[PDB]
Subunit: 206 residues, 3 copies
Amino acid sequence: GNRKLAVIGAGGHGKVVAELAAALGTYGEIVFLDDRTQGSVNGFPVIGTTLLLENSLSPEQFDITVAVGNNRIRRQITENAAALGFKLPVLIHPDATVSPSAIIGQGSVVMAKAVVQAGSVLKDGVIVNTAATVDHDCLLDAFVHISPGAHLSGNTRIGEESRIGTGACSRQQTTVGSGVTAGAGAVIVCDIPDGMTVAGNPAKPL
Amino acid sequence: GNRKLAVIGAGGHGKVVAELAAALGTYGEIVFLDDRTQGSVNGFPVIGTTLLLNSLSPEQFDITVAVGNNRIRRQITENAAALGFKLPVLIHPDATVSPSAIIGQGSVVMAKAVVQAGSVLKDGVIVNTAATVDHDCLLDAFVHISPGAHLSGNTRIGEESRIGTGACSRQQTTVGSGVTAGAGAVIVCDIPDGMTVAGNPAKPL
Amino acid sequence: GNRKLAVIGAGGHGKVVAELAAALGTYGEIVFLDDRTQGSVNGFPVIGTTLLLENSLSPEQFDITVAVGNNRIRRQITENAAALGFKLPVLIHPDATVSPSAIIGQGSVVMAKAVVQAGSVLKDGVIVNTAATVDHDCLLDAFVHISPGAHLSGNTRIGEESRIGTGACSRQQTTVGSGVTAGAGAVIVCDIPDGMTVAGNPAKPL
Ligand SMILES: CC(=O)SCCNC(=O)CCNC(=O)[C@H](O)C(C)(C)COP(=O)(O)OP(=O)(O)OC[C@H]1O[C@@H](n2cnc3c(N)ncnc32)[C@H](O)[C@@H]1OP(=O)(O)O
Ligand SMILES: CC(=O)SCCNC(=O)CCNC(=O)[C@H](O)C(C)(C)COP(=O)(O)OP(=O)(O)OC[C@H]1O[C@@H](n2cnc3c(N)ncnc32)[C@H](O)[C@@H]1OP(=O)(O)O
Ligand SMILES: CC(=O)SCCNC(=O)CCNC(=O)[C@H](O)C(C)(C)COP(=O)(O)OP(=O)(O)OC[C@H]1O[C@@H](n2cnc3c(N)ncnc32)[C@H](O)[C@@H]1OP(=O)(O)O
Ligand code: NA
């Protein structure tokens, strides 16, 4: 396998992902790509901008991960990287628990203390953030983000690019569409149509 | 100890429990009893129905009742107990259980779940995914604490009650038996038997 | 390094703390101090009252931790202990994940399943309780208490002695003043001024 990992995005998310990869203990060097930050971030060198991806980095030397919180931009850069033949390893924190029967698409990231249970399917570039849990038989579509401490009950579906906020939760058998935003603390007790922004207990359109 | 485990209930919960048991790495074979499905589920073989409870020797198989429903898990559990089966407490490797916690047979403590000092759990309790039960809590028989629910210190939950996903409780609160707390329920005062509550704070529906 | 630890406070909180230190497996003896409880708790001997701290105990023999939930009294006893020359080890439960870039002040306690992400700063005597998570670049001022299952998003500030209740949460870039009490389930989606007490979804003054 590649001995080097390039983490795209040196923001706060980038710092956690870089530390995630560092915790795995398998890489020989971990670096940042960032269009603005220069020098080194939290010990990790920034070697250049997102342009090194197209112009200088070899898919036979570098694994790539996209540490950008914005779902649409993460999709943008992830699809880009994949089209240039880079590997986008599913990154799972040593202190996460991921079921052996779970299927998780490339570029996804599973954070410290997060859990993905049996039969769950995660498409590409999903984020299951700090201590978030995706229970049994859930479907998380491309570039979904489950924020810290959110809990999905069994058979929860979340649509493409949707964003489930810190401390949110869902009842079992609930369905959330694409481009949805559930706020921090949202208690999702019924299906949520595409594009909507909901919050409160129970979760209702803001 | 027994080398084989039979998990009763091959639903979604039963899949998680079977994976929990496999994560333990201490059984030679883990199998499903299911009244419906046939063949294998998630790589685990279904070998018959709850009727094999008959064919099955308590000297060969441990038993666990992976049924979500508190009433039904109660029925099957007592059944297997009466038939003289060992119903081991199944604690996920990635769960943290206090050494001073007391946990009844048949109970299942899922991944990332925490049970703190001096907590008492009766028979057949489910503490689900990342649910936490803090110091000196009392969970009576066949309580189900759902994913990511958090009980503060000195919380009591009555027999067969069901606390929903991501619910929480203030310390020194008490929940009656047969209660249903919905997801996200913020329990800041006592709950009487049979009541179904919800919301922030938890009020009857 | 000291081979004995004294746990001040023998209530529920102290039981959890002494078990935490026991789980570390590095002390040869762990004892309680309490002004009321006598004998032995959970196998841990209560060897005296807090008076032993100023009277009998040697800083060359005993580390000190202040397992008092109440922020103001924890502050009081900790400062007392530090003034007397005692070491106040940061106690991190083996099943907690604490970032290597995080900074945590003496007398702080990080419980099982708790997580503190990158660049987070914690001042003296913080408690991050069971399964509570403090994400990236959060600032927790001295003697803050994050109750079980509370999830703080990135760049959350918590002022001195404030108390975030069980299962509470914050959206990112949220600031909370000193002496605040956010109760169980409080969904903090805006700043919160000093001394205030809030709860609800969203958190409002009661
Ligand atoms: C590592 C990490 O931290 S990942 C970070 C992920 N963090 C999150 O989950 C962010 C979640 N975002 C939120 O909750 C946001 O408040 C949003 C997106 C739902 C709302 O965005 P905005 O509309 O800009 O928030 P704004 O401050 O305008 O709030 C508008 C109103 O909705 C209410 N509201 C806002 N957020 C919430 C919420 N999560 N729950 C309930 N009510 C809310 C506010 O109280 C306000 O009500 P008012 O009319 O009484 O004043
Ligand atoms: C791994 C696993 O899957 S574990 C699975 C365990 N999952 C759970 O925790 C399930 C929890 N179940 C719930 O929370 C359910 O919503 C229940 C049991 C509380 C309600 O069940 P039902 O009676 O079918 O709910 P129903 O859809 O009729 O809701 C009726 C009203 O109550 C409200 N409501 C329902 N559940 C909740 C809740 N958890 N919090 C707040 N309000 C709620 C609804 O918004 C609705 O309000 P309206 O009258 O304004 O439309
Ligand atoms: C190891 C451990 O377990 S650490 C334990 C940590 N535990 C906690 O986090 C406790 C957090 N504290 C709370 O949430 C408390 O409820 C407090 C401090 C907010 C309440 O303070 P008190 O002054 O005692 O409130 P009290 O319960 O008397 O007030 C009841 C009223 O306030 C409301 N209320 C109180 N607490 C809450 C809450 N957490 N969320 C929503 N509403 C609340 C109730 O709706 C009720 O209103 P109503 O009867 O007029 O409809
Ligand atoms: Na949680």
